[PDB]
Symmetry: C3
Subunit: 152 residues, 3 copies
């Protein structure tokens, strides 16, 4: 689990848990203060127990190698804006299905919104997770046009 | 021991040592380059050995939960200003009595002074120590009015 | 190995390897995405294997502050590499421990906008014993070109 913080934002890029290791998963998330989990890949576990513990789970899958749709980006930035404002010091977790995968992508988008160029966001994440992004992802982050509407 | 660095500032939030483990405590502080220790809670150990090693100890206790008095904040900001300037690359350690406690509060104040909003300071610290601040502390950091007089 | 990242820059301050542990060395560098190695002290190992793996090795040996030419070459490398290879890493090492390896990294950070004290703290946060007195003194007198754009 890699943790990245920038302005009033703090993210936890985690691994996909299993219905079996769900209790320990929830236990850790709670300690990190995560209030929301965004699943950007296959949904592999039941979220009733997670939701019961006060952790809302959002399923926003986006085709691998494929860039997240504009709507996902807008929904993500909207989530970042409200959560870190209404719940000061909280954390948003994001995960894919087998290893970091494309989970780091949305985090990078949040950092770019925070004022970083995509290269900076990539380095900032890699400093925490050496193998963070793959070639295809770097190429589309290079073409990403930020809205730059978040205020800090 | 959590370490936080921002502009020309570097802080070490440590645990309260004992007269018995004082030697190892001093040994570590020296390696971190700390030149000053600020005790914000109960004074539990003799400081002669610490002072002899070139580490000045300051006792600035501030009430149960209660926000630090304006004078403590001014004294703290004055210490931050001169130490990191007169001793480039040094470190200021801060500790309470049983765990982190109120020790991260002053560090947050220094970060805010450095340009961060309190939420950013809280996240910046939490990235290093997950359970950093409690509800009461977050509430008064929210009401804290920085002087914003330190120059960088 | 300490890793420092600031703007579009990411550096790996490593230890001097041996011809014997060269394979594992290369394996790690590749995982960190390093494309270049700058050796600022004695050259102790053969670089054919390293160069073959796509990692260019530069010998810029320089106590004595790095010469203006070394600084210019270093800043030129920082400018082009992080631009032409987004997200890459530049490794730097001396001969026996951190040594003088951190100096050039500090210079890159100052170029990035940090005052030398900030650069020193930024590095020490990663490596407690980073710089020695002599080095702090000359970093204090260092006059940055401040020409790098971000």
């Amino acid at each position: 689990p890699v943790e990245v913080t920038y302005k009033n934002m703090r993210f936890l890029i985690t691994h996909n848990p299993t219905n079996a290791t769900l209790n320990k998963f929830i236990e850790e998330l709670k300690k990190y203060g995560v209030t929301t989990i965004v699943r950007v890949c296959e949904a592999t576990y039941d979220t009733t127990l997670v939701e019961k513990e006060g952790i809302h789970v959002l399923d926003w899958p986006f085709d691998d190698g494929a860039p997240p749709s504009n709507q996902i980006v807008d929904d993500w930035l909207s989530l970042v804006k409200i959560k870190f404002r209404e719940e000061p010091g909280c954390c948003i977790a994001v995960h894919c299905v087998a290893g970091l995968g494309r989970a780091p992508v949305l985090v990078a988008l949040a950092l770019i919104e925070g004022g970083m160029k995509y290269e900076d966001a990539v380095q900032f994440i890699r400093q925490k997770r050496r193998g963070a992004f793959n070639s295809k992802q770097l190429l589309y982050l290079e073409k990403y046009r930020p809205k730059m509407r978040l205020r800090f």
